[PDB]
From a paper:
Capsid is the primary structural protein of HIV and a critical part of the viral replication cycle, both in the assembly of viral particles and in the infection of host cells. The capsid protein (CA) of HIV-1 plays critical roles in both late and early stages of the viral replication cycle and is widely viewed as an important unexploited therapeutic target. During assembly, the viral RNA genome is packaged into a capsid particle composed of a lattice of CA protein hexamers that form a distinct fullerene cone shaped particle. After virus fusion with a target cell, the core is released into the cytoplasm and CA is thought to undergo a controlled disassembly reaction in order for reverse transcription of the viral genome to occur properly.
To further understand the mode of action of this novel class of compounds, we determined the crystal structure of HIV-1 CA NTD protein in complex with PF-3450074 using a CA protein construct that contained a single glycine residue in place of the cyclophilin binding loop (residues 87–99). Although the cyclophilin binding loop is important for viral infection, it is not required for proper HIV CA protein folding and in vitro multimerization function. Using this construct, the co-crystal structure of PF-3450074 was solved with the NTD of HIV-1 CA to 1.8 Å resolution. The structure of the complex showed that the overall fold of the CA protein is the same as previously described CA structures and illustrates that neither the compound, PF-3450074, nor the loop deletion caused any significant shifts in the protein structure. PF-3450074 occupies a preformed pocket in the HIV-1 CA NTD bounded by helices 3, 4, 5 and 7. The binding site for PF-3450074 is distinct from the sites targeted by CAP-1 and CAI/NYAD-1. These results confirm that PF-3450074 directly binds HIV CA and are consistent with this class of inhibitors acting via a unique mechanism. In the model, the R3 indole group which protrudes from the NTD in our structure localizes to the interface between capsid monomers in an assembled capsid and sits directly between the NTD of one capsid monomer and the C-terminal domain of another, making contacts to Tyr-169, Leu-172, Arg-173, Gln-179, and Lys-182.
Author numbering: 1 to 85, 96 to 146
């Protein structure tokens, strides 16, 4: 996640193994109940796309669900590019596939900012909503 350090520079703090376990624990315990959504949000405060990918990648099994989530992300990335045919970030940059941590932090702190972690979080939550709907 992005944090303000004591200096207060805005910098990246490494994602915690505790956060990753907490995320997998909720997915496994609640079996993609609606409860997964607020938990995903609570665990991803300040997340960069790199952080979010590391979170999502720790979910094992649920291959079909994860594939659906990836397709939702791909669709949102393509829609971003349709509405932003110039400039940076690209949709793939928001999803962290073609961007670096430094690029992500730069966009998040730019003036004006492009909150790429929040945008990606929104896309992921849209994907999670479809999974939740499907598994209900
Ligand atoms: C190699 C592979 N095959 C998959 C099939 C389904 C889901 C994930 C994978 C992967 C790894 C995989 O692609 N994981 C994703 C993160 C991810 C995980 C789970 C769901 C959605 C996004 C990832 O690391 N990146 C860079 C990524 C992010 C957005 C779109 C495409 C790729």
């Amino acid at each position: 996640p992005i944090v303000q350090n004591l200096q207060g520079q805005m910098v990246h703090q490494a994602i915690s193994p505790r956060t990753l376990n907490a995320w997998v624990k909720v997915v496994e315990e609640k079996a993609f109940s609606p409860e997964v959504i607020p938990m995903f949000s609570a665990l991803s405060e300040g997340a960069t796309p790199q952080d979010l990918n590391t979170m999502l990648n720790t979910v094992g099994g649920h291959q079909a669900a994860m594939q659906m989530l990836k397709e939702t992300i791909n669709e949102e990335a393509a829609e971003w590019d349709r509405l932003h045919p110039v400039g940076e970030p690209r949709g793939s940059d928001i999803a962290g596939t073609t961007s670096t941590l430094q690029e992500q932090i730069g966009w998040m702190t730019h003036n004006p900012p492009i909150p790429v972690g929040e945008i990606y979080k929104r896309w992921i939550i849209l994907g999670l909503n479809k999974i939740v709907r499907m598994y209900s």
